[PDB]
Amino acid sequence: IKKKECVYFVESSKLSDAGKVVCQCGYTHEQHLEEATKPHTFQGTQWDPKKHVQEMPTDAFGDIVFTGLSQKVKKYVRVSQDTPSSVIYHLMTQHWGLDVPNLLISVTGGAKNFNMKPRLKSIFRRGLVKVAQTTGAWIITGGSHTGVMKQVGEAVRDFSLSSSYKEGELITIGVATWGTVHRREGLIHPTGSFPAEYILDEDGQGNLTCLDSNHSHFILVDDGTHGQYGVEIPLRTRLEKFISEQTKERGGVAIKIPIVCVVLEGGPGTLHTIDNATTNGTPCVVVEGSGRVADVIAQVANLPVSDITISLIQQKLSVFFQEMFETFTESRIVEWTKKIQDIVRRRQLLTVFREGKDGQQDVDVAILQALLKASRSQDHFGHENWDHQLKLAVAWNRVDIARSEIFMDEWQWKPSDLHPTMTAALISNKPEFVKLFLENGVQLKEFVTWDTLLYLYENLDPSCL
Amino acid sequence: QDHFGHENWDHQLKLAVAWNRVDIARSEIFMDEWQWKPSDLHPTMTAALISNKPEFVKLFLENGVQLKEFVTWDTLLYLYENLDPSCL
Amino acid sequence: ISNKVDAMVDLLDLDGDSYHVNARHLLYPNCPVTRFPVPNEKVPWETEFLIYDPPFYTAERKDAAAMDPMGDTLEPLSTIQYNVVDGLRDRRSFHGPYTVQAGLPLNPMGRTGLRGRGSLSCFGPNHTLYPMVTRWRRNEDGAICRKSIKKMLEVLVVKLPLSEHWALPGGSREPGEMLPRKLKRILRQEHWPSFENLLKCGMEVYKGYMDDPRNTDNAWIETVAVSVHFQDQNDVELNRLNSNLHACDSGASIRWQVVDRRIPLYANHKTLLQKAAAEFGAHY
Amino acid sequence: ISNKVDAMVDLLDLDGDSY
Ligand SMILES: Nc1ncnc2c1nc(-c1ccccc1)n2[C@H]1C[C@H](O)[C@@H](COP(=O)(O)OP(=O)(O)OC[C@H]2O[C@@H](O)[C@@H](O)[C@@H]2O)O1
Numbered sequence A: 001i002k003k004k005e006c007v008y009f010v011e012s013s014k015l016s017d018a019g020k021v022v023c024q025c026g027y028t029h030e031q032h033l034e035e036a037t038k039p040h041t042f043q044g045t046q047w048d049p050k051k052h053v054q055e056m057p058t059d060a061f062g063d064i065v066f067t068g069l070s071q072k073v074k075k076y077v078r079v080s081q082d083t084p085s086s087v088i089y090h091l092m093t094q095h096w097g098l099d100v101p102n103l104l105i106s107v108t109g110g111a112k113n114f115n116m117k118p119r120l121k122s123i124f125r126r127g128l129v130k131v132a133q134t135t136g137a138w139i140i141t142g143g144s145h146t147g148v149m150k151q152v153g154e155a156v157r158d159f160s161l162s163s164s165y166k167e168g169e170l171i172t173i174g175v176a177t178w179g180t181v182h183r184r185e186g187l188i189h190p191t192g193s194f195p196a197e198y199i200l201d202e203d204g205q206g207n208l209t210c211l212d213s214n215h216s217h218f219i220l221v222d223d224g225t226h227g228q229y230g231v232e233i234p235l236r237t238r239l240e241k242f243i244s245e246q247t248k249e250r251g252g253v254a255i256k257i258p259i260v261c262v263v264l265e266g267g268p269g270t271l272h273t274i275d276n277a278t279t280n281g282t283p284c285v286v287v288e289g290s291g292r293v294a295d296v297i298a299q300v301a302n303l304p305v306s307d308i309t310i311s312l313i314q315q316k317l318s319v320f321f322q323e324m325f326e327t328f329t330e331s332r333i334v335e336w337t338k339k340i341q342d343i344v345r346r347r348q349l350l351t352v353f354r355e356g357k358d359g360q361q362d363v364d365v366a367i368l369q370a371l372l373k374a375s376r377s378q379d380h381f382g383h384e385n386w387d388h389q390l391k392l393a394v395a396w397n398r399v400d401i402a403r404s405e406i407f408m409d410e411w412q413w414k415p416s417d418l419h420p421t422m423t424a425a426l427i428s429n430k431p432e433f434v435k436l437f438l439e440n441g442v443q444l445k446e447f448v449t450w451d452t453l454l455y456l457y458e459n460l461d462p463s464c465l
Numbered sequence B: 001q002d003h004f005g006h007e008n009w010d011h012q013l014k015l016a017v018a019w020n021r022v023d024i025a026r027s028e029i030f031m032d033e034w035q036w037k038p039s040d041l042h043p044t045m046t047a048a049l050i051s052n053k054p055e056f057v058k059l060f061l062e063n064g065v066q067l068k069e070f071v072t073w074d075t076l077l078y079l080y081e082n083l084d085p086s087c088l
Numbered sequence C: 001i002s003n004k005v006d007a008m009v010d011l012l013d014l015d016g017d018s019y020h021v022n023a024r025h026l027l028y029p030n031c032p033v034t035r036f037p038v039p040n041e042k043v044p045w046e047t048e049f050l051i052y053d054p055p056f057y058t059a060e061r062k063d064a065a066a067m068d069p070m071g072d073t074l075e076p077l078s079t080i081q082y083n084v085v086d087g088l089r090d091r092r093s094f095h096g097p098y099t100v101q102a103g104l105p106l107n108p109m110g111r112t113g114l115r116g117r118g119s120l121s122c123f124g125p126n127h128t129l130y131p132m133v134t135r136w137r138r139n140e141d142g143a144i145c146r147k148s149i150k151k152m153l154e155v156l157v158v159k160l161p162l163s164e165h166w167a168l169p170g171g172s173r174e175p176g177e178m179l180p181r182k183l184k185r186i187l188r189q190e191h192w193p194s195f196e197n198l199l200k201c202g203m204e205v206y207k208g209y210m211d212d213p214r215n216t217d218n219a220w221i222e223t224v225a226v227s228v229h230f231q232d233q234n235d236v237e238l239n240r241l242n243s244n245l246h247a248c249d250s251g252a253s254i255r256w257q258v259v260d261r262r263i264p265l266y267a268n269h270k271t272l273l274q275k276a277a278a279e280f281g282a283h284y
Numbered sequence D: 001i002s003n004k005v006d007a008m009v010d011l012l013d014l015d016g017d018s019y
Helices: A085-095 A118-135 A148-160 A233-245 A268-279 A292-299 A310-316 A330-345 A355-359 A364-377 A384-396 A399-404 A415-428 A431-440 A450-457 B007-019 B022-027 B038-051 B054-063 B073-080 C002-012 C184-189 C195-200 C235-243 C267-276 D002-012
Strands: A007-010 A054-057 A063-066 A074-080 A104-107 A138-141 A171-177 A217-222 A259-263 A284-287 A350-353 C127-129 C154-159 C203-209 C222-227 C253-258
Touching: A007 A074, A085 A233, A104 A118, A104 A148, A104 A233, A118 A138, A118 A148, A118 A364, A118 A384, A138 A148, A138 A233, A148 A171, A171 A233, A233 A259, A233 A268, A259 A268, A259 A292, A259 A364, A268 A284, A268 A292, A268 A330, A284 A292, A284 A364, A292 A310, A292 A330, A292 A350, A310 A330, A350 A355, A350 A364, A364 A384, A364 A399, A384 A399, A384 A415, A399 A431, A415 A431, A415 A450, B007 B022, B007 B038, B022 B054, B038 B054, B038 B073, C002 D002, C203 C267, C222 C267
Parallel strands: A074 A217, A104 A138, A104 A259, A138 A171, A171 A217, A259 A284, A284 A350, C127 C222
Antiparallel strands: A007 A054, A063 A074, C154 C253, C203 C222
């Protein structure tokens, strides 16, 4: 049952690889995840990871429930690094039952635990849930139970157990590392239809990490290694690039699935992700004050390109990792200056969620301002951008935005241009958009044609009598 | 106060049970990100049940105290020895 | 609506310290002997001015002007000498040569507001060390145990039956000061064997002044910090130095305790542990 | 009235490059 396309990187690690740097007992020697080539291979040479890491059918693919934390089943799967993005997308949709998302919400930041102001908590974890409740979106978190990826899990917990509504299920996809997950043992069973349980132990872990409790689905990537951290990055960007290219069809109008990044406190690796996201043309949002790299960007966001005041402004990394601001490194500071300049240079692709000036509007509204600004700034050959924005607004089911942003602007439009959107709204039963289009002037006596009726009657409610 | 690990949080919860101040017990010692397991609330859950404070019962159920696991045989036996003495 | 208007009626009414401190208390561990107030500015007499007068008090137990069981005295008695090594009492300072201006010594780190030594059995700076033994806080396997990203230590501390705190095994050199580097508390608490051999090659954390609550204006405790650290999980030495625990002082509890800024240790012990937890990148 | 008091509870929280 589809245990043959999803493979996992496994190979003996102590063929010949010592160092020794992490002596402990050995480099994951016999009676460990290393089990296949325990007899004598040819030489071993230098490990040099083209010493063939076997891709055999996966042994960790099932349904996981947390023993004494929650009681709802959760799906997971062990995935190799070289797995094509299309295979994972097919697995997530066709066999996990997930509907095609209307929006991707990438949540990045720092793994280290932290706290913010209670007002910021109460606004962020109340807006992030509502961004998804209305839209039917996906939340690609960081996986495990520490930091930004733990706070989003807390946000989902603050909803799915207080206002436990089946209508509008929260879909959070956890992408983490196999080899970093702590208790992956007792979770390996090559016939995986089992509802095994996870002992959520945060105390036992050393240089490892446990999975977060509140996550609808889990995706684990590995190279057959132990303790490595930078392995899930080049399968998250690759997956997101493909999901963004994938398209939705629905009733009458077809859209291109958008994507957004939501940052928080982050280290050197969050800044690089922010840079790589904006280069590909994906808008990102920064909150007004919680964290090392986020707050630097928030403060330098309206200034023109005149920088390297960063030597002073980087004090917000209060712990001063590598022991102070002048002694991070001259090379790393001069590298971060270029990155900050690059981020600030794309005005359209970047927005900052200034607390006092934008939270009263909402966080929801700014998190949809990012996508609309990106679509407006995209090159479109004339008029295509407005209709694409309307198509997105139909799927958002956000009539307030669809009005206040793409009908309060004075672009040229004829009432006939709304007919393909009018049909989609009628099929999807959104009377609020019907009212908006009638206010803007869609004359039904002219809109309702013979072919329009014929098409409408082929899209009745299948559950109707 | 010096407390050797985790004792301070449970002492604060014990004080909050007696305060009958659910707003403080929430906003101060549950809005802070300390490590806690739902099993750790069982001695406090029993005190709240005995003292008839449904507002703390709601708070602990929100935080995730699963009754199906909390209610043990010994817990029932202890609970039935602390009925309301004025009850029929 | 009635509950929200109440939420609105209330909404519209909105229109350097580095001198020794633990020694400048108000009281002293025993008897009234209340000290003389000395604000922060007036602690160094080197560049400050008088108009103070401390309440002279000495030796607290037997004979203020004799203290024969404790050995010395200066009661217009030249006799004593505050330099080099002398007889069994070092009387030196790890902060340079201090001042014998008034005939009696003076604690260089500031004027803490008294005249005679309380309990310290010598007007000269008493010498003591606190060897802390630390292990890497192993969990059920090697692993280590990081708090957030930094590693965690475990020190050995002892709680005396009547004492209300925990203390690193310390002491003060008993019959003689040139005699074993094998402090009295550990001797009473451990069957002395090769802890000396282990300590002699230990790393020196803090040579300096201890902010004891028993400094008056003289007879001030300075200390040296030796920190032997164990790396492996069992070792002949870890298993031996766990099996060599006799103690048996009717309640004296020696349990391995994790390091943090919330240990019931004395303040000076806590700051010494802070100093010792920075050489190895510990948590604290 | 209930929808307008909600509109008021939220209203009172407002306190070279050429290379
Ligand atoms: N899953 C993870 N991945 C990467 N390091 C992780 C991690 N769990 C932990 C972790 C382990 C024990 C306890 C608490 C936390 N650590 C550690 C090791 C690292 O040296 C350090 C720097 O902290 P950082 O804040 O400097 O981190 P980055 O800025 O590089 O990005 C963070 C990632 O989260 C994603 O959403 C992406 O955004 C980005 O890959 O924490």
